[PDB]
Design an enzyme around this catalytic site. Structure first.
Site, PDB file in Angstrom:
ATOM      1  CD  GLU A 132      17.321  32.442  56.925  1.00 50.42           C
ATOM      2  OE1 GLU A 132      18.289  31.956  56.436  1.00 50.42           O
ATOM      3  OE2 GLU A 132      16.916  33.089  57.774  1.00 50.42           O
ATOM      4  N   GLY A 215      10.857  41.394  50.613  1.00 48.33           N
ATOM      5  CA  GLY A 215       9.629  41.354  50.244  1.00 48.33           C
ATOM      6  C   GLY A 215       8.961  42.828  49.722  1.00 48.33           C
ATOM      7  CG  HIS A 261      17.769  43.370  55.749  1.00 49.53           C
ATOM      8  ND1 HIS A 261      18.419  43.542  54.657  1.00 49.53           N
ATOM      9  CD2 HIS A 261      17.016  42.266  55.961  1.00 49.53           C
ATOM     10  CE1 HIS A 261      18.389  42.209  54.187  1.00 49.53           C
ATOM     11  NE2 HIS A 261      17.632  41.593  55.037  1.00 49.53           N
ATOM     12  NE  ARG A 269      21.124  32.073  57.165  1.00 52.72           N
ATOM     13  CZ  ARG A 269      22.086  32.257  56.037  1.00 52.72           C
ATOM     14  NH1 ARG A 269      23.269  31.597  56.041  1.00 52.72           N
ATOM     15  NH2 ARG A 269      21.657  32.925  54.952  1.00 52.72           N
ATOM     16  CB  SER A 271      19.059  39.038  63.969  1.00 52.96           C
ATOM     17  OG  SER A 271      18.230  38.402  63.235  1.00 52.96           O
TER      18      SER A 271
END
EC number: 2.7.7.108
Length: 337
Positions: A132, A215, A261, A269, A271
């Protein structure tokens, strides 16, 4: 009007002559120009199939058909590939199960096993933050956790992500792995509470009440999150899930939480930890998606969003093998003086 038809026609022309290396570049290029170009997918499928790459051919046909369900040239070909793919995927789950079984043959108190387990414990923390963009090094993460002293010249935020992960892995390994019973909502919020508790205490352990941009994506409406998370935990404790292969199940659990989400931060992290909780609960060892696998990870997640989770599952399965290969890389060798 995409100008990829040119590229597709040349690809077919090259294929005719047998310039197959130039063909697949023109095929790849044709789907760069128009990723949703049914004839290019279908023709590139047939191409792949001629070279006996059945999985790719099947992926390509499956993509063509998710865009154009009635595309007869694809329907006909995917009928032939789908059963042979089920076969190939099933044989890979067998090799993984082989290595799991050998790993679970090692006596629990074995020292070599004890040491690689704790070596890979710091590896999993390093990779799950570094993937990440966390700039902390492996030796820096071990420093932070073995002592309790902050690394000079690294942000508070980066170091709290590491402690946060540690806090979460303690809680999983201590509480939830051993525990007979349902994976409740509270378990998922408790992991997130520890994952995020040192960085963002306010949001740590509670679902978002807002829309988010991920995104170019917009995950489910915050009012659907509560509904979809209750379907998720119900599916996690369902009879169907136990009917799945444990690696398959863990991969789907991971993708679903990513898709939903449900938090503002730390979905990835949170999941990747749930994935490992699911694997361990089934007697499989926990796994790492290495930093350097960032692109592959994004792309297989993207393929899962475009209607085909199978590449993601295969990805998680390869990660599972790479873990086992490492655990196995500590086994006894003949030697005497």
């Amino acid at each position: 009007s995409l100008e990829a038809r040119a590229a597709l026609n040349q690809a077919l022309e090259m294929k005719r002559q047998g310039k197959r290396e130039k063909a697949q570049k023109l095929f790849m290029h044709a789907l760069k120009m128009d990723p949703d170009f049914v004839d290019a997918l279908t023709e590139f499928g047939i191409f792949s199939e001629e070279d006996k790459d059945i999985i790719q051919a099947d992926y390509l046909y499956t993509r063509a058909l998710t865009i154009s369900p009635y595309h007869e040239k694809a329907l006909v070909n995917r009928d032939r590939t789908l059963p042979l793919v089920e076969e190939i995927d099933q044989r890979y789950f067998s090799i993984i199960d082989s290595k799991v079984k050998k790993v679970m043959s090692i006596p629990k108190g074995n020292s070599a096993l004890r040491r690689v387990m704790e070596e890979t414990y710091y590896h999993h923390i390093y990779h799950t933050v570094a993937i990440e963009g966390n700039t902390l090094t492996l030796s820096e993460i071990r420093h932070i956790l073995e002592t309790r002293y902050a690394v000079p010249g690294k942000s508070d935020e980066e170091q709290n992500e590491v402690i946060g992960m540690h806090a979460a892995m303690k809680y999983i390994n201590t509480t939830l792995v051993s525990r007979i019973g349902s994976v409740t909502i509270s378990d998922v919020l408790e992991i997130h509470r520890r994952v995020l508790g040192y960085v963002d205490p306010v949001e740590a352990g509670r679902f978002r009440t807002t829309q988010v941009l991920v995104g170019h994506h917009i995950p489910p409406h915050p009012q659907d999150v509560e509904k979809q998370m209750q379907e998720f935990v119900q599916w996690l404790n369902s009879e169907e899930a136990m009917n799945l292969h444990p690696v398959e199940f863990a991969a789907l659990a991971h993708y679903k939480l990513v898709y939903i989400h449900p938090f503002i931060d730390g979905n990835g992290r949170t999941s990747r930890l749930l994935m490992n909780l699911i694997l361990m609960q089934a007697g499989y060892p926990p796994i790492t998606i290495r930093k350097e696998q960032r692109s592959d990870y994004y792309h297989v997640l993207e393929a899962a969003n475009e209607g085909d989770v199978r590449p993601f599952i295969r990805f998680i399965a390869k990660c599972t093998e790479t873990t086992l290969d490492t655990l196995l890389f500590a086994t006894t060798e003949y030697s005497v003086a």
